[PDB]
Amino acid sequence: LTEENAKTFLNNFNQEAEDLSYQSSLASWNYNTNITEENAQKMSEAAAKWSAFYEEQSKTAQSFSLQEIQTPIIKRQLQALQQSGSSALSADKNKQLNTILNTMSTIYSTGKVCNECLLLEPGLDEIMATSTDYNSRLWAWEGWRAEVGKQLRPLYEEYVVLKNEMARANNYNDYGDYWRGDYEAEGADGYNYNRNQLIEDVERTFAEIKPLYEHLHAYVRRKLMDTYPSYISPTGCLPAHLLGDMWGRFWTNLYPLTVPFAQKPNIDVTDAMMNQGWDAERIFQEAEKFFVSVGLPHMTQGFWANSMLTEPADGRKVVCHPTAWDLGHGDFRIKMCTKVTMDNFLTAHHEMGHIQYDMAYARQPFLLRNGANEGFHEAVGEIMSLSAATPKHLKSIGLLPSDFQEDSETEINFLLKQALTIVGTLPFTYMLEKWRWMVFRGEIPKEQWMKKWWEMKREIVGVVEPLPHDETYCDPASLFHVSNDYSFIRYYTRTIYQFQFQEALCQAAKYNGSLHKCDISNSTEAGQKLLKMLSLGNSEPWTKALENVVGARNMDVKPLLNYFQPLFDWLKEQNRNSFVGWNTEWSPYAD
Amino acid sequence: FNATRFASVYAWNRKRISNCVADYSVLYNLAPFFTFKCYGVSPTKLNDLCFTNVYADSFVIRGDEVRQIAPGQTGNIADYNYKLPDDFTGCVIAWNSNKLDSKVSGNYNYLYRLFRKSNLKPFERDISTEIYQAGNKPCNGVAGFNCYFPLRSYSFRPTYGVGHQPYRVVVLSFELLHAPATVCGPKKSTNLV
Numbered sequence A: 001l002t003e004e005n006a007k008t009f010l011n012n013f014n015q016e017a018e019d020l021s022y023q024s025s026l027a028s029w030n031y032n033t034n035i036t037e038e039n040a041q042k043m044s045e046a047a048a049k050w051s052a053f054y055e056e057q058s059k060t061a062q063s064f065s066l067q068e069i070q071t072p073i074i075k076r077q078l079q080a081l082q083q084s085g086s087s088a089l090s091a092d093k094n095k096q097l098n099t100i101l102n103t104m105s106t107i108y109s110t111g112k113v114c115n116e117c118l119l120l121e122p123g124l125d126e127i128m129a130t131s132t133d134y135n136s137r138l139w140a141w142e143g144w145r146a147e148v149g150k151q152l153r154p155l156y157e158e159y160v161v162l163k164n165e166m167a168r169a170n171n172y173n174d175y176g177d178y179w180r181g182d183y184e185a186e187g188a189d190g191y192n193y194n195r196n197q198l199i200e201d202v203e204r205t206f207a208e209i210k211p212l213y214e215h216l217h218a219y220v221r222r223k224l225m226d227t228y229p230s231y232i233s234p235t236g237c238l239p240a241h242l243l244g245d246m247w248g249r250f251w252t253n254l255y256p257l258t259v260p261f262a263q264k265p266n267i268d269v270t271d272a273m274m275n276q277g278w279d280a281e282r283i284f285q286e287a288e289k290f291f292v293s294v295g296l297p298h299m300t301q302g303f304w305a306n307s308m309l310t311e312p313a314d315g316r317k318v319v320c321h322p323t324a325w326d327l328g329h330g331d332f333r334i335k336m337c338t339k340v341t342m343d344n345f346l347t348a349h350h351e352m353g354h355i356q357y358d359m360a361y362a363r364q365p366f367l368l369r370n371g372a373n374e375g376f377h378e379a380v381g382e383i384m385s386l387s388a389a390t391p392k393h394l395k396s397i398g399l400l401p402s403d404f405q406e407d408s409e410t411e412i413n414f415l416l417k418q419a420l421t422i423v424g425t426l427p428f429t430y431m432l433e434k435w436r437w438m439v440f441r442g443e444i445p446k447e448q449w450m451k452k453w454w455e456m457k458r459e460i461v462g463v464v465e466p467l468p469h470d471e472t473y474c475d476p477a478s479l480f481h482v483s484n485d486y487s488f489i490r491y492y493t494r495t496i497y498q499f500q501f502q503e504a505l506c507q508a509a510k511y512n513g514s515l516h517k518c519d520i521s522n523s524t525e526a527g528q529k530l531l532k533m534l535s536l537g538n539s540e541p542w543t544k545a546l547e548n549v550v551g552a553r554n555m556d557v558k559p560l561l562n563y564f565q566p567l568f569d570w571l572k573e574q575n576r577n578s579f580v581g582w583n584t585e586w587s588p589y590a591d
Numbered sequence B: 001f002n003a004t005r006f007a008s009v010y011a012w013n014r015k016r017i018s019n020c021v022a023d024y025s026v027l028y029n030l031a032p033f034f035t036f037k038c039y040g041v042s043p044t045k046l047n048d049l050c051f052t053n054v055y056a057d058s059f060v061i062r063g064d065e066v067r068q069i070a071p072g073q074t075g076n077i078a079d080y081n082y083k084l085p086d087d088f089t090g091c092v093i094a095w096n097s098n099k100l101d102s103k104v105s106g107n108y109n110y111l112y113r114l115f116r117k118s119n120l121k122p123f124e125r126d127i128s129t130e131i132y133q134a135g136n137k138p139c140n141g142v143a144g145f146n147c148y149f150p151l152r153s154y155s156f157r158p159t160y161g162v163g164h165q166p167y168r169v170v171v172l173s174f175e176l177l178h179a180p181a182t183v184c185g186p187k188k189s190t191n192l193v
């Protein structure tokens, strides 16, 4: 049979895929280091050659049988290779699918709505976040919605129709079920995991996430009445433009408005990174010394030679996008606009997690050079910045003396923003995910699109619109991840994954203190607990991955409440004279 | 050491070092020398040992494949490309070779296989290029279902990491068969009184 015959096809595929993927990634990195036509001419042809080679290798793999293979080590690899997608239909479909995606991307990039008027990124949030005027955001919400809604609705409906048509070619129910198929697990009777039952798990997690968010959303409503008396409902919802963002997923600027105690700020290390002689190079040295202290290998010699840490002023076109690029072949490098600020310190500790993750699964072939799912990729970066955010770590670095007096209110106002920047987007994510799960399969027709959208926005998130919108608009398609092909289920799972991994690393180190301030400094036990987790990568599914992390093979909402323990009781003791709930009848436009 | 072209992992050539005096125990020419592990013979006793036949096994492997060249281990190179016997008499010498073999256009000059019908023989030379007939499907020069080409090339790059870099390994394995030795060591202690 083809028991050992499939061992040759995949090893022949990956042998040249490792070569061509690096040829494409090097051109991409060179285009990112300087945006010129000569670099783009080399990047486009490399990307086209790689996309053509992938299809030339996947066109002949469909003839091989899958159910007769016995060794699961290659069954996990072969199921990931047959995911071609647009290879089943003709080229006329792929041409008209891309010629509208490029058109809508160019339209969304050139969004100019006036009647002090700027582009998309220029002056976007600087008016939404910094400006506190009601009339300044009244137009900034309505015009921003109406300039991209009615001009994209006829283009997005045909796109959704094409996405549904693409499901019949690969034997799928809808396009939303295709992104759920990445959380796939096969094996014994206890290792299988269905891709359609994820809605139930998300609902079970949200049913316990809601009691944590109820008091957090009720407390921020009482204090906002000192600025918007005739705009904040007493026992209803809040406006969408009063959330510091056009969508309400990043409540970063709302911290000065919702500060628990304004008599003392949070920790500050920006001034100490200037008078002590700190540069961009010594920060990475201490970060790597903290990473190796748990039992991790050292870095590549070329990581200090080829990585662009300091920003050169010799004529290079800098994009300034902090992201750990995995170029392949074991190459580890970082393209980041590094400075001595704390914002650049958080992302510098975040990218080192991705670097040490990619260093783990470098032994397996290119096909298995990925995570077990879409939630394990960018979840290891946040636990390191969480462990480094403790005041004891900063005191052990050498900036502040050992006589620092850490108070409880400091931890309270730290956890407040740490929750508002992490768990504040969970209802916004769940609402849009349930909306996409309902409208892609065919549960909600096009005749009740916006009505159901607003009903779900009022019920799940608890946000009321200031003016009535009909069903002729296309508001939900105005997001960056909704317009183009971008999955969003990963951000809802990573928030649980990080708090699970942090607690699993803190329990194994025998730390009987606070969980939200637990540190893995000088802990050789958690290092071997994390190496066997990150070493499997895509070879083992998430079921076998979580069993060596915490032991359980299911989503746990217990860490979500066990992390913010001083915050839940604080909000409970501060809401003794407040109404907990929501109203779906109150609206600012109810004249 | 100063060769402009090396062979592959399976098509490596063999040269006999004889009829000349060798300078052993002093061979560090490059800086790193990550691998200088010898088996059975001490590193400081190479000069006072005479030899008659010494073969040089020069092959280019990855970084994670350097540890696989050891008696008693199993991997991807120690079973289908090159493997040392259990009672191996020699030394393994490797260094960093990512400087003079750096080309981003593509490295399709070196070849290596990964499949065979059985295990390797100690000091085996394989240059055949037949189709891998594994199952019960006859192959008559077909590329695809149940028939493939076992020979494939490398993907070396100047930024190949730290544990996967191309390690050009030269095995200094000697043969001793109670033969008249001709390769003598450095003998320089002249002081006349």
Ligand SMILES: *[C@@H]1O[C@H](CO)[C@@H](O)[C@H](O)[C@H]1NC(C)=O
Pocket: A027, A030, A034, A036, A038, A039, A042
């Ligand atoms: C990218 O563009 C720069 C500027 O012309 C050029 O020096 C460099 O060689 C280019 N890189 C590649 C890979 O073509």
Ligand SMILES: *[C@@H]1O[C@H](CO)[C@@H](O)[C@H](O)[C@H]1NC(C)=O
Pocket: A290, A396, A397, A521, A522
């Ligand atoms: C590891 O070393 C000591 C342990 O006594 C302490 O400073 C801290 O836990 C760690 N140091 C740093 C710099 O992380």
Ligand SMILES: [Zn+2]
Pocket: A378, A379, A380, A382, A494, A495, A497, A498
């Ligand atoms: Zn995360």
